[PDB]
């Protein structure tokens, strides 16, 4: 790109405070040649295929530390090419030739070369490299682009951090589906040479229509309909580890899946284009339980067989896509011998991917969804309430509004069962405790917003007062001790919600017929506190401290 050389400016935002204190931070440039499989002259070869070339790494940890900052500095990052050492040293070997090997100078993954460049501080770059000016600019994208508009303009390329920040601003709408093709074991088949497998991912809807520009190779580049993995020269297990960007509409990912096409890339363009994808794997970005694809590693299944079927959305989508899907279909097929015959097409070929989804609306939890599905999951409400605490505050905070609303619905509908009331009490306590954290304190304004505007309960305040009065009545209980202490920690917002419910009652029924009763509840909380406190301090000194606090 002739218009990018003078504007090849790379900015890496989201670098939180812990990002800086990382002991070892390295800016790694992947040098991959796009073009011919073989650097040979005389015959046509497949063009546009990606091959590993080398890795350039510079330890920029102290550069990100802010120790050194100067625009005019042009840090020459040494480039380390892969060891294609097969020409010089072979010229001197006489009087004892006993060697039977092959040429492996390009087949190594760039992961191994990168590991070597990390291990070897000095790179024998031999004058091959790249000059970059490295600086850290305080603040976010806006602050960097306004306090350093000269360095960083709106045309400057933008790159985000592989994860989440230490401060989650309310409304950080993102859909970062980072896909990393870790590795894949592909059988050589009838071919003596191992297939030059190239993972050409294809994002299709549930109807199979390929989503255009869904896959993004990386920062500073537009999306593409399909992204091709680095074609490895005759490798049985090509290890890619290629992290790519996927930005689907967060509403559309509910009906979108990435289909992974693996084609044998022969050394000849005619054979390359006459060879179809011998196997295709695929992953649905939504779990069967209504949640999106989980954050972690998913092992895809390379399917073999009729080319139409292995590309038929109405068929291969119905086919399990992962080894987890393999085993779940197999096990759920064991309890019912009703039309469950394993297909012999399930070859040993497998594919591995890493899906770091950095999103705001995407949901990854069974317990959270089921508890949000309380009106149809009444049987697991007792379990979903128990297991919502293990659901991370990050999962909760995305739809804390809906979680609160559903809890209040559970309370108003079935408050008769006090055990579920206790479960919702404790879930709410954990909720406020986690929101009060530094990570989630920024949604405390959102929490108050929900309290003051979106709150929709009219009698739960009674029940919560009852439950907390029971806690303070049973203060000496060791199991309760932590529960009541946590209730102490979040008393403020607890009674914010309680007062909201009470006032909603007030304005919905005109006058408080039980205002006397409610005030008596307040007074009895006072005096139950008094029994709590007049007990010997040795049992609950920290509890009395939190009470005073």
Swiss-Prot record:
Superkingdom to which the source organism belongs: Eukaryota
Location relative to the cell: Cytoplasm; Cell membrane; Cell projection, Podosome
N6-acetyllysine: residues bearing it: 549
Residues bearing PTM Phosphoserine: 96
Domain C2 DOCK-type: 174-358
Similarity remark: Belongs to the DOCK family.
Complex and partners: Interacts with CRK and CRKL. Interacts (via N-terminus) with tensin TNS3 (via N-terminus); the interaction increases DOCK5 guanine nucleotide exchange activity towards Rac. Interacts with ELMO1.
UniProt remark on domains: The DOCKER domain may mediate some GEF activity.
Biological role: Guanine nucleotide exchange factor (GEF) for Rho and Rac. GEF proteins activate small GTPases by exchanging bound GDP for free GTP. Along with DOCK1, mediates CRK/CRKL regulation of epithelial and endothelial cell spreading and migration on type IV collagen.
Protein name: Dedicator of cytokinesis protein 5
Source species of the chain: Homo sapiens (Human)
Protein encoded by which gene: DOCK5
Residue range from the parent sequence: 270 to 818 of 1870
């Amino acid at each position: 790109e002739i218009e990018k050389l003078n504007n090849l400016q790379a900015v890496f935002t989201d670098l939180s405070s812990m990002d800086l204190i990382r002991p070892r931070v390295s800016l790694v440039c992947q040098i991959v040649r796009v073009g011919h499989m073989e650097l040979k002259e005389g015959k046509k070869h497949t063009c546009g295929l990606r091959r590993p070339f080398g890795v350039a790494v510079m330890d920029i940890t102290d550069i990100i530390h802010g120790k050194v900052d100067d625009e005019e500095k042009q840090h020459f990052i040494p480039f380390q090419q892969i060891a294609m050492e097969t020409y010089i040293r072979q010229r001197q070997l006489i009087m004892s030739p006993l060697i039977t090997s092959h040429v492996i100078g390009e087949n190594e993954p760039l992961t191994s070369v990168l590991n070597k460049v990390i291990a070897a501080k000095e790179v024998n770059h031999k004058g091959q490299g790249l000059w970059v000016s490295l600086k850290l600019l305080p603040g976010d994208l806006t602050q960097v682009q306004k306090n350093f508009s000269h360095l960083v303009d709106r045309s400057t390329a933008i790159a985000r951090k592989m994860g989440f920040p230490e401060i989650i601003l309310p409304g950080d709408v993102r859909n970062d589906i980072y896909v990393t093709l870790i590795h894949g074991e592909f059988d050589k088949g009838k071919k003596k040479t191992p297939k030059n497998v190239e993972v050409t991912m294809s994002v299709h809807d549930e109807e199979g229509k390929l989503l255009e520009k869904a896959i993004h190779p990386g920062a500073g580049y537009e999306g593409i309909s399909e992204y091709k993995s680095v074609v490895y020269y005759q490798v049985k297990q090509p290890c890619w580890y290629e992290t790519v960007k996927v930005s689907i509409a967060i509403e559309e990912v509910t009906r979108c899946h990435i289909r992974f096409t693996f084609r044998h890339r022969s050394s000849q363009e005619t054979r390359d284009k006459s060879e179809r994808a011998f196997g295709v794997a695929f992953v649905k970005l939504m779990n069967p339980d209504g949640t999106t694809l989980q954050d972690g590693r998913h092992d895809l299944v390379v399917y073999k067989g009729d080319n139409k079927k292995m590309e038929d959305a109405k068929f291969y989508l119905t086919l399990p896509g992962t080894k987890m899907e393999m085993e779940e279909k197999e096990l759920q097929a064991s309890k019912n011998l009703v039309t469950f015959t394993p297909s012999k097409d399930s070859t040993k070929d497998s594919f591995q991917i890493a899906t770091l989804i950095c999103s705001t609306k995407l949901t990854q939890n069974v317990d959270l969804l089921g508890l949000l599905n309380w009106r149809s999951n009444s049987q697991n409400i007792k379990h979903n309430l128990k297991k919502l605490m293990e659901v991370d505050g990050g999962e909760i905070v995305k739809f804390l509004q809906d979680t609160l609303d559903a809890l209040f619905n559970i309370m108003m509908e079935m408050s008769d069962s006090e055990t579920y009331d206790f479960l919702v009490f404790d879930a709410l306590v954990f909720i406020i405790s986690l929101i009060g954290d530094i990570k989630f304190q920024h949604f405390n304004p959102v929490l108050e917003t929900y309290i003051y505007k979106h709150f929709s309960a009219t009698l739960a305040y009674v029940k919560l007062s009852k439950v907390l009065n029971f806690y303070v009545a049973n203060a000496d209980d060791s199991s309760k001790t932590e529960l009541l202490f946590a209730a102490l920690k979040a008393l403020k917002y607890l009674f914010r919600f309680i007062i909201q419910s009470r006032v909603l009652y007030l304005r919905f029924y005109g006058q408080s017929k039980d205002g006397d009763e409610f005030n008596n509840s307040i007074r009895q909380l006072f005096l139950a506190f008094n029994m709590l406190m007049d007990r010997p301090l040795e049992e609950a000194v920290k509890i009395k401290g939190a009470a005073l606090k």
